[PDB]
Ligand binder design. Structure first.
Ligand SMILES: O=C(O)[C@H]1[C@H]2CC[C@H](CC2)[C@@H]1Nc1nc(-c2n[nH]c3ncc(F)cc23)ncc1F
Length: 277
């Protein structure tokens, strides 16, 4: 039933936002999920039996020890590893404003699939290197957003040095964002410099694959390095941890979800959401 899911998501998102601004968001979130009711039934009972995988929903599921999708969310996009592997190595890099950031750099060749509300992509990358990106979204803006995420996700030096400012982004709870999100929010405010310094190259026009330029204009002759455009599976469930501030981590310690990665809501629920604590 799609009506339950639509309302569950709407409820989950509101709960995570309202909990995130608490002193102990995890406690606050557990209180809200126990008493809030969707269409009569208690929410806890829905999470236990509902198959929906969503950022806010999987946060709530994780909060009560339920298995969730191994995939992780970054910049709104759901990354699933199709091939390859990497390992973590806390490096320290230098931005284009001489600000130092301690970043978890991933070493190894990986293949991914990015999925978003308004764009998808296949992303090949390796140690601080974007090999290939085949984005395919709704329109210009939705596709640019997907490329910005890919560039920041790649951890390439040109992207790091493309920073032109001091990164002091905070969240609803007025806490500093972790490095990778600091970079992301900066290049979402304006990706002008990022796209210039990324670099262009000559492309060999193949069907479907169309190139794109730093101004977001196509070309069958030249495109940006590794980035192509186009037009148009199973789920592994795994145990996950959650801490005070609703940061969900897999066993290997990588942040799968956080309040920072939940979308905004439309708030036209088909079922009855009574928010009790
Ligand atoms: O590293 C983390 O703790 C999180 C942070 C928020 C989302 C992202 C990006 C940073 C990351 N989560 C995860 N990242 C990765 C990953 N694999 N290969 C990568 N290359 C660069 C990168 F940058 C992250 C990754 N694999 C599993 C994850 F679960």
């Amino acid at each position: 039933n799609d009506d339950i899911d639509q309302s569950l998501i709407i409820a989950a998102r509101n709960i995570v936002r309202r909990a995130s601004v608490s002193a102990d968001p995890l406690a606050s979130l557990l209180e809200m999920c126990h008493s809030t009711q969707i269409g009569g039934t208690r929410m806890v009972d829905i999470l236990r039996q509902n198959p929906t995988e969503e950022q806010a929903v999987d946060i709530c599921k994780a909060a009560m020890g339920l298995r969730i999708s191994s995939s992780f969310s970054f910049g709104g996009f759901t990354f699933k590893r199709t091939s390859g592997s990497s390992i973590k190595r806390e490096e320290e890099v230098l931005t284009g404003n001489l600000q130092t950031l301690k970043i978890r750099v991933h070493e190894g060749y990986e293949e991914f699939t990015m999925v978003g509300k308004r764009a998808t992509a296949i992303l090949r990358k390796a140690t601080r290197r974007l090999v290939q990106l085949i984005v395919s979204g709704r329109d210009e803006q939705s596709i640019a957003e997907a490329i910005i995420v890919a560039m920041v996700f790649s951890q390439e030096d040109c992207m790091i040095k493309a920073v032109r400012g001091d990164l002091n982004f905070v969240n609803r709870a007025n806490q500093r964002l972790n490095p990778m999100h600091q970079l992301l929010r900066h290049f979402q405010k304006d990706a002008k410099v990022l796209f210039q310094n990324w670099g262009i190259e000559h492309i060999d026009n193949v069907m479907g694959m169309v190139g794109v330029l730093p101004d977001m204009t196509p070309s069958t002759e030249m495109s940006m390095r590794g980035i192509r455009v186009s037009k148009m599976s199973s789920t592994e469930r795994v145990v996950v941890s959650i801490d005070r501030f609703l940061r969900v981590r897999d066993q290997r310690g990588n942040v799968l979800l956080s309040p920072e990665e939940v979308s905004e809501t439309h708030g036209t629920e088909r079922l009855t959401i009574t928010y009790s604590s």
